[PDB]
Design an enzyme around this catalytic site. Structure first.
Site, PDB file in Angstrom:
ATOM      1  N   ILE A 113       0.739  -1.253   0.000  1.00 35.48           N
ATOM      2  CA  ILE A 113       0.000   0.000   0.000  1.00 35.48           C
ATOM      3  C   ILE A 113       0.775   1.314   0.000  1.00 35.48           C
ATOM      4  O   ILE A 113       0.167   2.333  -0.281  1.00 35.48           O
ATOM      5  CB  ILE A 113      -1.170   0.032   1.018  1.00 35.48           C
ATOM      6  CG1 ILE A 113      -0.690  -0.166   2.467  1.00 35.48           C
ATOM      7  CG2 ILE A 113      -2.219  -0.998   0.646  1.00 35.48           C
ATOM      8  CD1 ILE A 113      -1.783  -0.487   3.475  1.00 35.48           C
ATOM      9  N   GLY A 114       2.068   1.337   0.295  1.00 32.51           N
ATOM     10  CA  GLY A 114       2.796   2.588   0.284  1.00 32.51           C
ATOM     11  C   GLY A 114       4.242   2.377   0.693  1.00 32.51           C
ATOM     12  O   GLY A 114       4.654   1.239   0.942  1.00 32.51           O
ATOM     13  N   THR A 139       8.638   6.816   5.764  1.00 30.75           N
ATOM     14  CA  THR A 139      10.010   6.899   6.256  1.00 30.75           C
ATOM     15  C   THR A 139      10.435   5.469   6.622  1.00 30.75           C
ATOM     16  O   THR A 139       9.794   4.836   7.456  1.00 30.75           O
ATOM     17  CB  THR A 139      10.119   7.894   7.447  1.00 30.75           C
ATOM     18  OG1 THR A 139       9.236   7.485   8.498  1.00 30.75           O
ATOM     19  CG2 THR A 139       9.568   9.273   7.087  1.00 30.75           C
ATOM     20  N   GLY A 154       9.841   2.519   5.369  1.00 33.65           N
ATOM     21  CA  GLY A 154       9.105   2.086   4.190  1.00 33.65           C
ATOM     22  C   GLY A 154       8.600   0.660   4.083  1.00 33.65           C
ATOM     23  O   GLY A 154       8.491  -0.042   5.075  1.00 33.65           O
ATOM     24  N   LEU A 197      -6.091   1.760   7.710  1.00 33.21           N
ATOM     25  CA  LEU A 197      -7.037   2.809   7.343  1.00 33.21           C
ATOM     26  C   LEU A 197      -7.112   2.915   5.829  1.00 33.21           C
ATOM     27  O   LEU A 197      -6.110   2.706   5.175  1.00 33.21           O
ATOM     28  CB  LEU A 197      -6.621   4.147   7.951  1.00 33.21           C
ATOM     29  CG  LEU A 197      -7.065   4.251   9.419  1.00 33.21           C
ATOM     30  CD1 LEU A 197      -5.854   4.323  10.298  1.00 33.21           C
ATOM     31  CD2 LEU A 197      -7.879   5.521   9.555  1.00 33.21           C
ATOM     32  N   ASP A 222      -5.165   7.896   2.353  1.00 38.99           N
ATOM     33  CA  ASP A 222      -4.515   9.084   2.855  1.00 38.99           C
ATOM     34  C   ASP A 222      -5.254  10.299   2.297  1.00 38.99           C
ATOM     35  O   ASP A 222      -5.809  10.260   1.222  1.00 38.99           O
ATOM     36  CB  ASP A 222      -3.000   9.004   2.558  1.00 38.99           C
ATOM     37  CG  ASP A 222      -2.640   9.383   1.133  1.00 38.99           C
ATOM     38  OD1 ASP A 222      -3.026  10.479   0.661  1.00 38.99           O
ATOM     39  OD2 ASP A 222      -1.944   8.676   0.376  1.00 38.99           O
ATOM     40  N   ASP A 266       6.129  16.746  10.670  1.00 39.10           N
ATOM     41  CA  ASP A 266       6.010  16.490   9.238  1.00 39.10           C
ATOM     42  C   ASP A 266       4.546  16.326   8.820  1.00 39.10           C
ATOM     43  O   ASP A 266       4.237  15.371   8.095  1.00 39.10           O
ATOM     44  CB  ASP A 266       6.742  15.191   8.875  1.00 39.10           C
ATOM     45  CG  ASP A 266       7.109  15.083   7.387  1.00 39.10           C
ATOM     46  OD1 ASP A 266       7.139  16.104   6.657  1.00 39.10           O
ATOM     47  OD2 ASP A 266       7.399  13.986   6.841  1.00 39.10           O
ATOM     48  N   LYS A 308       1.493  16.577   6.586  1.00 42.86           N
ATOM     49  CA  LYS A 308       1.218  16.842   5.188  1.00 42.86           C
ATOM     50  C   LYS A 308       0.170  15.827   4.806  1.00 42.86           C
ATOM     51  O   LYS A 308      -0.015  14.846   5.526  1.00 42.86           O
ATOM     52  CB  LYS A 308       2.512  16.655   4.393  1.00 42.86           C
ATOM     53  CG  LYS A 308       3.038  15.247   4.351  1.00 42.86           C
ATOM     54  CD  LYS A 308       4.464  15.308   3.838  1.00 42.86           C
ATOM     55  CE  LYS A 308       5.176  14.011   4.176  1.00 42.86           C
ATOM     56  NZ  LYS A 308       6.078  13.615   3.084  1.00 42.86           N
ATOM     57  N   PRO A 309      -0.565  16.088   3.732  1.00 46.80           N
ATOM     58  CA  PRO A 309      -1.759  15.279   3.469  1.00 46.80           C
ATOM     59  C   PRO A 309      -1.448  13.796   3.312  1.00 46.80           C
ATOM     60  O   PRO A 309      -2.325  12.996   3.660  1.00 46.80           O
ATOM     61  CB  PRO A 309      -2.353  15.888   2.177  1.00 46.80           C
ATOM     62  CG  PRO A 309      -1.725  17.258   2.052  1.00 46.80           C
ATOM     63  CD  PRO A 309      -0.378  17.170   2.747  1.00 46.80           C
TER      64      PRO A 309
HETATM   65  C1  CK2 Z   1       3.879   5.170   8.025  1.00 46.38           C
HETATM   66  C2  CK2 Z   1       2.563   4.650   7.523  1.00 46.38           C
HETATM   67  N1  CK2 Z   1       2.288   4.677   6.207  1.00 46.38           N
HETATM   68  C3  CK2 Z   1       1.070   4.167   5.964  1.00 46.38           C
HETATM   69  C4  CK2 Z   1       0.647   4.144   4.523  1.00 46.38           C
HETATM   70  C5  CK2 Z   1       0.413   3.710   7.220  1.00 46.38           C
HETATM   71  C6  CK2 Z   1      -0.857   3.148   7.268  1.00 46.38           C
HETATM   72  C7  CK2 Z   1      -1.409   2.759   8.484  1.00 46.38           C
HETATM   73  C8  CK2 Z   1      -2.680   2.194   8.485  1.00 46.38           C
HETATM   74  N2  CK2 Z   1      -3.326   2.042   7.324  1.00 46.38           N
HETATM   75  C9  CK2 Z   1      -2.767   2.416   6.165  1.00 46.38           C
HETATM   76  N3  CK2 Z   1      -3.477   2.258   4.964  1.00 46.38           N
HETATM   77  N4  CK2 Z   1      -1.544   2.961   6.135  1.00 46.38           N
HETATM   78  S1  CK2 Z   1       1.420   3.989   8.602  1.00 46.38           S
END
Ligand code: CK2
Lengths: 258, 296
Positions: free
Chosen positions: B10-11, B14, B16, B83, B86, B127, B129-130
């Site tokens: 999902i992303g 920092t 990572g 969640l 973002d 930090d 930010k959206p």
């Molecule tokens: C650092 C984090 N980056 C993300 C994308 C986090 C997170 C936590 C809970 N749910 C989602 N989708 N993401 S916590």
């Protein structure tokens, strides 16, 4: 001026109870001693000077060391590896850019390897369960310093100096919370420099009367008196710098009027 | 680890990679943040040491919940509540239509509660930010990514060279101050409020000086009347051009009077006068706040 000076102070008071080492612990350590602790902490002061670390990093490393030795037996030949891993972690938590790991190997005279230091990092994080944000004398002193009228450079430097001296001696100092040690240093620094006393605004905030600080203040005054003779001198040498208004040269009051 | 089944990436944060994951024993869906642990390099990254120590202390409905830390020989995993997405993504999806005003106000209200909670426990997020602001389908919004967060029991010294965001950076940091304060988080939240409102970044600078200058063209070039001390700040130059303050009505048109008053308060130049999260929460802009849900 914050809306949370109060809230942070109350919260720090809560947290310091939870990050307290076990006062009895050195006597359960079969291979190490208050005296080796003292040498280790003194060495860390020098490492903090040589790498230009903040004072807060030194205080956090000591807190980490004491909490780790409260649960783990360590042999004299490993105690410096504990100290080095604690200093590295405190530098990661508190410093803008921490020295590289290689630098922490070099400071031991290559007596441990990089992998050893890193595995001790992991083991310290585990024992401490990642609770690194512990209150320190330095942090209580910083808050206390707002209640000065008016603010006095020497008072502040000498309170810092006395607060550091208490890191060296587990001895007595493990008995007192950082807020009380900070209480005693501030008073003793004020008195020494100006003849004033623990201010009423701080009495109300901390709920500590001058009398409740007496046990800790008698320990600190004896330490201050005995400092020039103590087997460990790094904090002294450090606090003769002009950055610190040379306060460790000042002459301690022979009596406290208490 | 053995009870988690990775579902999809999902992303990155920092340090990572973040994966959506499912607890095979309880059914819980979680976000797993995997740190890639080089044990010959530098060991555990300071971003992770901070995010875990600080997050472990912050239990609040508008701060992301760290459920667990799985800490083995070569891997470190943070387990967070999951969640949906973002705020950045939601704003991009909501461009054209715009985020509804009632939802803006709910998100702002919730963020100010999370931050007032951070600041009253001596944590500066540093930090905002959206991309760091997570939403769910039930209308909640939470602060996330405490990688760059600092405990301010002692004041936090500034980074010479600063790898925090540029767009959401407070002018005191740009002008070279020595310490952070809680004001820098209010300043960023103000930027985000205006960004939800207009559907574009308020101060999209391209360098430190460009960024200072966008701030100056909207708020006016500051001087000692507005901001005692500014002209003795390290990076302050008397050659700065002198721009006029702009009417808030041109800056954020959709906003009523109460919102223009709170935004101008979150964007005070002088960090000593900039409103605190605690006080923002009293502001009349909130008297009629609800809990609408996002069309996701
Ligand atoms: C650092 C984090 N980056 C993300 C994308 C986090 C997170 C936590 C809970 N749910 C989602 N989708 N993401 S916590």
């Amino acid at each position: 001026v914050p809306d949370y000076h109060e809230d942070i102070h109350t919260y720090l008071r809560e947290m310091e109870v939870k990050c307290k080492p076990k006062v009895g612990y050195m006597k359960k350590q079969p291979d190490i001693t208050n005296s080796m602790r003292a040498i280790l902490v003194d060495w860390l002061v020098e490492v903090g000077e040589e790498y230009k670390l903040q004072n807060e990093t030194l205080h956090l490393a000591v807190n980490y060391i004491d909490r780790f030795l409260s649960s783990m037996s360590v042999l004299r030949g490993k105690l410096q590896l504990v100290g080095t891993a604690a200093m590295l972690l405190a530098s990661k938590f508190e410093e803008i850019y921490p020295p590289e790991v290689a630098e922490f190997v070099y400071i031991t005279d290559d007596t441990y390897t990089k992998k050893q230091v890193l595995r001790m990092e992991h083991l310290v994080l585990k024992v401490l369960t990642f609770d690194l944000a512990a209150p320190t004398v330095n942090q209580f002193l910083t808050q206390y310093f707002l209640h000065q009228q008016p603010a006095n450079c020497k008072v502040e430097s000498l309170a810092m100096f006395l607060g550091e001296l208490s890191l060296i001696d587990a001895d007595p100092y493990l008995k007192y919370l950082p807020s009380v040690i900070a209480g005693a240093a501030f008073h003793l620094a004020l008195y020494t420099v100006t003849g004033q006393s623990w201010p009423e605004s701080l009495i109300r905030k901390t709920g500590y009367t001058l009398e409740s600080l007496k046990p800790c203040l008698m320990d600190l005054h004896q330490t201050y008196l005995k400092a020039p003779q103590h087997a460990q001198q790094s904090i002294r040498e450090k606090y003769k710098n002009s950055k610190y208004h040379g306060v460790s040269l000042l002459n301690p009051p022979e009596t406290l009027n208490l | 680890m053995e009870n988690f089944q990775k579902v999809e990436k999902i992303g990155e944060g920092t340090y990572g990679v973040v994966y959506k994951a499912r607890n095979k024993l309880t059914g819980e869906v979680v976000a797993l943040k995997k740190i890639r642990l080089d044990t010959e390099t530098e060991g555990v990254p300071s971003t992770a040491i901070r995010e875990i120590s600080l997050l472990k202390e912050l239990n609040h409905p508008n701060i992301v919940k760290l459920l667990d830390v799985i800490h083995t020989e070569n891997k470190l995993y943070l387990v967070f509540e999951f969640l949906h997405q973002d705020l950045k993504k939601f704003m991009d999806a909501s461009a054209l239509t715009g985020i509804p005003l009632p939802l803006i106000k709910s998100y702002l209200f919730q963020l100010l509660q999370g931050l007032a909670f951070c600041h009253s426990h001596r944590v500066l997020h540093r930090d905002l930010k959206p991309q760091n602001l997570l939403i769910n389908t039930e209308g909640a919004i939470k602060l996330a990514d405490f990688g760059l967060a600092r405990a301010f029991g002692v004041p936090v010294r500034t980074y010479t060279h600063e790898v925090v965001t540029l767009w959401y950076r407070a002018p005191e940091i740009l002008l070279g101050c020595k310490y952070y304060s809680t004001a820098v988080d209010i300043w960023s939240l103000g930027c985000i409020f205006a960004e939800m409102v207009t559907r574009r970044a308020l101060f999209p600078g391209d360098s430190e000086i460009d960024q200072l200058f966008r701030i100056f063209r909207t708020l006016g070039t500051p001087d000692e009347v507005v901001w005692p001390g500014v002209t003795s700040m390290p990076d302050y130059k008397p050659s700065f051009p002198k721009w006029a303050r702009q009417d808030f009505s041109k800056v954020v048109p959709p906003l009523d009077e109460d919102g223009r008053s709170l935004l101008s308060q979150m964007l005070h130049y002088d960090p000593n006068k900039r409103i605190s999260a605690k006080a923002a929460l009293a502001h009349p802009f909130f008297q009629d706040v609800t809990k609408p849900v996002p069309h996701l």
